[PDB]
Amino acid sequence: SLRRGIYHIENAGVPSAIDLKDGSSSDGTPIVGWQFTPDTINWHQLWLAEPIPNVADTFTLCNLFSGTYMDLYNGSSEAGTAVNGWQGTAFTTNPHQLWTIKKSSDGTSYKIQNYGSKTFVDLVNGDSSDGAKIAGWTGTWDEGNPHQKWYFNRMSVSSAEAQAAIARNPHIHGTYRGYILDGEYLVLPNATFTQIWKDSGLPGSKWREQIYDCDDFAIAMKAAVGKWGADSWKANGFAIFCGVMLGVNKAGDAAHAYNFTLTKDHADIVFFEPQNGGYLNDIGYDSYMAFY
Amino acid sequence: SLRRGIYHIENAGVPSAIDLKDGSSSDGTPIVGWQFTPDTINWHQLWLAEPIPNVADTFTLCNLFSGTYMDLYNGSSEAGTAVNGWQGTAFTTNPHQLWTIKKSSDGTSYKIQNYGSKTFVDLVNGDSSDGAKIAGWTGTWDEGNPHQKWYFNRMSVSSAEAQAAIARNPHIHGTYRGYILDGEYLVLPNATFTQIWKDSGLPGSKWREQIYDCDDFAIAMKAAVGKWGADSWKANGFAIFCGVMLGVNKAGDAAHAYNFTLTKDHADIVFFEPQNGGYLNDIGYDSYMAFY
Ligand SMILES: C[C@@H]1O[C@@H](O[C@@H]2[C@@H](O[C@H]3O[C@H](CO)[C@H](O)[C@H](O)[C@H]3O)[C@@H](O)[C@@H](CO)O[C@@H]2O)[C@@H](O)[C@H](O)[C@@H]1O
Ligand SMILES: C[C@@H]1O[C@@H](O[C@@H]2[C@@H](O[C@H]3O[C@H](CO)[C@H](O)[C@H](O)[C@H]3O)[C@@H](O)[C@@H](CO)O[C@@H]2O)[C@@H](O)[C@H](O)[C@@H]1O
Ligand SMILES: C[C@@H]1O[C@@H](O[C@@H]2[C@@H](O[C@H]3O[C@H](CO)[C@H](O)[C@H](O)[C@H]3O)[C@@H](O)[C@@H](CO)O[C@@H]2O)[C@@H](O)[C@H](O)[C@@H]1O
Ligand SMILES: C[C@@H]1O[C@@H](O[C@@H]2[C@@H](O[C@H]3O[C@H](CO)[C@H](O)[C@H](O)[C@H]3O)[C@@H](O)[C@@H](CO)O[C@@H]2O)[C@@H](O)[C@H](O)[C@@H]1O
Ligand SMILES: C[C@@H]1O[C@@H](O[C@@H]2[C@@H](O[C@H]3O[C@H](CO)[C@H](O)[C@H](O)[C@H]3O)[C@@H](O)[C@@H](CO)O[C@H]2O)[C@@H](O)[C@H](O)[C@@H]1O
Ligand SMILES: C[C@@H]1O[C@@H](O[C@@H]2[C@@H](O[C@H]3O[C@H](CO)[C@H](O)[C@H](O)[C@H]3O)[C@@H](O)[C@@H](CO)O[C@H]2O)[C@@H](O)[C@H](O)[C@@H]1O
Ligand SMILES: [Ca+2]
Ligand SMILES: [Ca+2]
Ligand SMILES: [Ca+2]
Ligand SMILES: [Ca+2]
Ligand SMILES: [Mn+2]
Ligand SMILES: [Mn+2]
Ligand code: NA
Ligand code: NA
């Protein structure tokens, strides 16, 4: 089954993602095919899949930016029926906004079926143009038709996945304790993580003994990523990944506070130095505490 | 011995505090007697006492606001010699800026002796006027003269003192771990703690599932108090007290993130709810983790 989380949904035939046009919150905003840039935030192209309890493999799909839901217009089963953003709720009973999502016949891409109509999300004609129509269309679960096949490129980690990335790391102290704050996290590209650091004003901050030292930099960076999350996205039910760690050096006679993020493959953590914006695989300390 | 820390230094005879006039960083800024308001930040009247290693009961006194040092003008032993703010360093060898501070004959107030001159800090004539001269003056360690007696009203806690206040509290979970970030903390009046909360913009923030929920409010409040410390004070070598706690309810089926501060007497903690600005002796959770 597709896991709860945030997805960049990319057509299997052409490099077009499912895009809520101009990120508009208006009811009936077209959802279209649009080109995308890897290792960026694709602002109009992120979808929070929320599993419906007791209805197998069936989800709402909420646009992270707009906070509006992928909606089959009037739930029509006619081929070519508009797929739009529409106001709704994460556990709606409105079948216009319920989507059964299961693996295609290629075992890697998915098909997206409207729960009400039993028609499929279709990039009409496989058109690769920016703003190409996406519609509900007749189809089958088993057929090869790439118009109706969608890679769910996973952009978020569970707290369990983040816990596993930390536990893999070779710089964890024997006394380590980790404190988990949320359930599902958007993983940022380093380019975005860096931009939030810059926009916080931290690059201008001076180290001062106790009054603005390592712990102040690390906590300011976590607060800044928190603020950016709330200020940037209209959807609820996820957080932004940014960790704080306290570490101790090999000699056991010096400690340091810093941040950490996750690799592109979500398998490992990377240390971030909020005093200079560096990324490091080894920051010269082993973590004895994290909160994220 | 006087402990390292931040002091409001109040004359034993009249209610005048040692005040760096207009908080000016200029060399030769007069240090004067001035009236004060209890349970406020007295912005020009806070002094960081830094013990000199291997010189018994002898300190620098750094004005928290200006970052300049209490200085006996040209180290003169003549009665009536000016006491001013002057540029210096926490462990200076300049005897103009070194002060032997020991209990008076009343066992409660201190006398402040210049290490070089062996003359005492004197509120000239016991004048209670705002802007009354303070000078180096002839005296003895044992005499009752209240012109030369000073209550060192302690405004800061050590990390040890903060650890003891938490451990007293009846709402600490059996699994509690505390993570200490600094060494010496200015304790805020609730009136100031509240003002920093207001000035952060947190009173306007909405609770949103995961994306701005309890942990975001608590960490935003700690970041805001950190920022306020660095932006407000020019001295180094202390921090501002503001804790984050994670707690669990009695049933063990709900958790919450919040802040805590310290009572006026520095003996106990008080919980702060950053979602509404409330202070509570019981927030309905027992802490399993703190960082401060
Ligand atoms: C059958 C129909 O279902 C609901 O209407 C839907 C629309 O529903 C969604 O938007 C409306 C406001 O337009 C409302 O907020 C509702 O809670 C939300 O789920 C929407 O799916 C459109 C576009 O496909 O179709 C229908 O108009 C309901 O509001 C109607 O009363 C009616 O029962
Ligand atoms: C290239 C083309 O692929 C297939 O046609 C698709 C359409 O496919 C879907 O709809 C048709 C009926 O219109 C049928 O129900 C099929 O099972 C279903 O997958 C559809 O994707 C449209 C809109 O994008 O494009 C093409 O017409 C195939 O059926 C055709 O023979 C042809 O090979
Ligand atoms: C004996 C004298 O000591 C120092 O001068 C002090 C002053 O010292 C302080 O301020 C000066 C700059 O004016 C400098 O920054 C120094 O490091 C600092 O400790 C000051 O205490 C004044 C007022 O009482 O008296 C003397 O001028 C030193 O700089 C001189 O060279 C000289 O050795
Ligand atoms: C009321 C007054 O108190 C004392 O005099 C103080 C001064 O006291 C200090 O200086 C004198 C010499 O001027 C002497 O060395 C004394 O031991 C020392 O404490 C001084 O505080 C000034 C400036 O504020 O005010 C008074 O003159 C006492 O000696 C007087 O007899 C008289 O009772
Ligand atoms: C917020 C906005 O994002 C970008 O524009 C979007 C656009 O973004 C996608 O397509 C562009 C090329 O047009 C790039 O491939 C991006 O990497 C994609 O994410 C689309 O989402 C359309 C349709 O909804 O809306 C635009 O606003 C960017 O070009 C803008 O400067 C701006 O940052
Ligand atoms: C920063 C400034 O603080 C206050 O003025 C100070 C003044 O403060 C003390 O004296 C006033 C009465 O003049 C009150 O008792 C305060 O509680 C004291 O802290 C002195 O420090 C003088 C001399 O250095 O400087 C003034 O700036 C306050 O009145 C101002 O509004 C302002 O907040
Ligand atoms: Ca949370
Ligand atoms: Ca600090
Ligand atoms: Ca520190
Ligand atoms: Ca959160
Ligand atoms: Mn290591
Ligand atoms: Mn309790
Ligand atoms: Na389900
Ligand atoms: Na000493």
PDB file of N, CA and C in Angstrom, chain A residues 14-45:
ATOM      1  N   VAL A  14       5.836  10.829 -19.763  1.00  0.00           N
ATOM      2  CA  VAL A  14       6.545  12.105 -20.045  1.00  0.00           C
ATOM      3  C   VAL A  14       6.869  12.776 -18.723  1.00  0.00           C
ATOM      4  N   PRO A  15       7.909  13.646 -18.676  1.00  0.00           N
ATOM      5  CA  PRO A  15       8.334  14.276 -17.424  1.00  0.00           C
ATOM      6  C   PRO A  15       7.422  15.458 -17.034  1.00  0.00           C
ATOM      7  N   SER A  16       6.149  15.168 -16.795  1.00  0.00           N
ATOM      8  CA  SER A  16       5.164  16.140 -16.296  1.00  0.00           C
ATOM      9  C   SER A  16       4.664  15.694 -14.939  1.00  0.00           C
ATOM     10  N   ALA A  17       4.613  16.604 -13.989  1.00  0.00           N
ATOM     11  CA  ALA A  17       4.085  16.328 -12.642  1.00  0.00           C
ATOM     12  C   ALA A  17       2.638  16.823 -12.549  1.00  0.00           C
ATOM     13  N   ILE A  18       1.878  16.252 -11.661  1.00  0.00           N
ATOM     14  CA  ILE A  18       0.533  16.767 -11.332  1.00  0.00           C
ATOM     15  C   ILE A  18       0.684  18.117 -10.599  1.00  0.00           C
ATOM     16  N   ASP A  19       0.082  19.171 -11.160  1.00  0.00           N
ATOM     17  CA  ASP A  19       0.338  20.569 -10.780  1.00  0.00           C
ATOM     18  C   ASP A  19      -1.011  21.283 -10.591  1.00  0.00           C
ATOM     19  N   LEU A  20      -1.216  21.887  -9.447  1.00  0.00           N
ATOM     20  CA  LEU A  20      -2.410  22.737  -9.202  1.00  0.00           C
ATOM     21  C   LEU A  20      -2.127  24.130  -9.741  1.00  0.00           C
ATOM     22  N   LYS A  21      -2.802  24.516 -10.802  1.00  0.00           N
ATOM     23  CA  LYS A  21      -2.339  25.641 -11.646  1.00  0.00           C
ATOM     24  C   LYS A  21      -2.229  26.927 -10.778  1.00  0.00           C
ATOM     25  N   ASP A  22      -1.063  27.545 -10.791  1.00  0.00           N
ATOM     26  CA  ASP A  22      -0.739  28.798 -10.040  1.00  0.00           C
ATOM     27  C   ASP A  22      -0.919  28.586  -8.521  1.00  0.00           C
ATOM     28  N   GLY A  23      -1.032  27.354  -8.083  1.00  0.00           N
ATOM     29  CA  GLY A  23      -1.180  27.036  -6.664  1.00  0.00           C
ATOM     30  C   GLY A  23      -2.457  27.645  -6.062  1.00  0.00           C
ATOM     31  N   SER A  24      -3.444  27.966  -6.894  1.00  0.00           N
ATOM     32  CA  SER A  24      -4.635  28.745  -6.447  1.00  0.00           C
ATOM     33  C   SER A  24      -5.497  27.893  -5.490  1.00  0.00           C
ATOM     34  N   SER A  25      -6.031  28.528  -4.454  1.00  0.00           N
ATOM     35  CA  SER A  25      -6.966  27.901  -3.500  1.00  0.00           C
ATOM     36  C   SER A  25      -8.409  27.988  -4.031  1.00  0.00           C
ATOM     37  N   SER A  26      -8.616  28.688  -5.153  1.00  0.00           N
ATOM     38  CA  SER A  26      -9.999  28.840  -5.700  1.00  0.00           C
ATOM     39  C   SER A  26     -10.589  27.451  -5.984  1.00  0.00           C
ATOM     40  N   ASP A  27     -11.869  27.268  -5.698  1.00  0.00           N
ATOM     41  CA  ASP A  27     -12.616  26.058  -6.094  1.00  0.00           C
ATOM     42  C   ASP A  27     -12.622  25.960  -7.616  1.00  0.00           C
ATOM     43  N   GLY A  28     -12.258  24.811  -8.150  1.00  0.00           N
ATOM     44  CA  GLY A  28     -12.303  24.549  -9.602  1.00  0.00           C
ATOM     45  C   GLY A  28     -11.029  25.018 -10.318  1.00  0.00           C
ATOM     46  N   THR A  29      -9.964  25.260  -9.565  1.00  0.00           N
ATOM     47  CA  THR A  29      -8.621  25.509 -10.129  1.00  0.00           C
ATOM     48  C   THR A  29      -8.140  24.246 -10.854  1.00  0.00           C
ATOM     49  N   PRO A  30      -7.800  24.341 -12.146  1.00  0.00           N
ATOM     50  CA  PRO A  30      -7.409  23.170 -12.918  1.00  0.00           C
ATOM     51  C   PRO A  30      -6.187  22.490 -12.301  1.00  0.00           C
ATOM     52  N   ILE A  31      -6.167  21.178 -12.331  1.00  0.00           N
ATOM     53  CA  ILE A  31      -4.945  20.393 -12.062  1.00  0.00           C
ATOM     54  C   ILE A  31      -4.391  19.878 -13.406  1.00  0.00           C
ATOM     55  N   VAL A  32      -3.144  20.212 -13.698  1.00  0.00           N
ATOM     56  CA  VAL A  32      -2.574  20.097 -15.061  1.00  0.00           C
ATOM     57  C   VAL A  32      -1.243  19.352 -14.984  1.00  0.00           C
ATOM     58  N   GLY A  33      -0.741  18.903 -16.131  1.00  0.00           N
ATOM     59  CA  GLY A  33       0.643  18.464 -16.265  1.00  0.00           C
ATOM     60  C   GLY A  33       1.575  19.639 -16.428  1.00  0.00           C
ATOM     61  N   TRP A  34       2.707  19.596 -15.761  1.00  0.00           N
ATOM     62  CA  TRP A  34       3.692  20.707 -15.781  1.00  0.00           C
ATOM     63  C   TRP A  34       5.102  20.149 -15.549  1.00  0.00           C
ATOM     64  N   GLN A  35       6.093  20.721 -16.194  1.00  0.00           N
ATOM     65  CA  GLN A  35       7.498  20.264 -16.022  1.00  0.00           C
ATOM     66  C   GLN A  35       7.990  20.652 -14.619  1.00  0.00           C
ATOM     67  N   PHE A  36       9.082  20.065 -14.183  1.00  0.00           N
ATOM     68  CA  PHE A  36       9.536  20.201 -12.779  1.00  0.00           C
ATOM     69  C   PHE A  36      11.060  20.187 -12.741  1.00  0.00           C
ATOM     70  N   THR A  37      11.616  20.688 -11.652  1.00  0.00           N
ATOM     71  CA  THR A  37      13.063  20.735 -11.423  1.00  0.00           C
ATOM     72  C   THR A  37      13.394  19.818 -10.249  1.00  0.00           C
ATOM     73  N   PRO A  38      14.186  18.760 -10.461  1.00  0.00           N
ATOM     74  CA  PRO A  38      14.590  17.875  -9.363  1.00  0.00           C
ATOM     75  C   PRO A  38      15.413  18.628  -8.304  1.00  0.00           C
ATOM     76  N   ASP A  39      15.261  18.242  -7.035  1.00  0.00           N
ATOM     77  CA  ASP A  39      16.096  18.757  -5.908  1.00  0.00           C
ATOM     78  C   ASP A  39      15.780  20.235  -5.695  1.00  0.00           C
ATOM     79  N   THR A  40      14.527  20.616  -5.969  1.00  0.00           N
ATOM     80  CA  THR A  40      13.936  21.898  -5.571  1.00  0.00           C
ATOM     81  C   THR A  40      12.654  21.621  -4.785  1.00  0.00           C
ATOM     82  N   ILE A  41      12.113  22.630  -4.161  1.00  0.00           N
ATOM     83  CA  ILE A  41      10.686  22.674  -3.822  1.00  0.00           C
ATOM     84  C   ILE A  41       9.907  22.987  -5.099  1.00  0.00           C
ATOM     85  N   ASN A  42       9.111  22.047  -5.572  1.00  0.00           N
ATOM     86  CA  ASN A  42       8.144  22.311  -6.677  1.00  0.00           C
ATOM     87  C   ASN A  42       6.812  22.759  -6.066  1.00  0.00           C
ATOM     88  N   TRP A  43       6.637  24.068  -5.923  1.00  0.00           N
ATOM     89  CA  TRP A  43       5.705  24.697  -4.953  1.00  0.00           C
ATOM     90  C   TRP A  43       4.247  24.247  -5.216  1.00  0.00           C
ATOM     91  N   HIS A  44       3.879  23.994  -6.469  1.00  0.00           N
ATOM     92  CA  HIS A  44       2.449  23.742  -6.822  1.00  0.00           C
ATOM     93  C   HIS A  44       2.199  22.233  -7.051  1.00  0.00           C
ATOM     94  N   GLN A  45       3.168  21.379  -6.715  1.00  0.00           N
ATOM     95  CA  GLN A  45       3.226  19.990  -7.246  1.00  0.00           C
ATOM     96  C   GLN A  45       3.420  18.975  -6.084  1.00  0.00           C
TER      97      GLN A  45
END
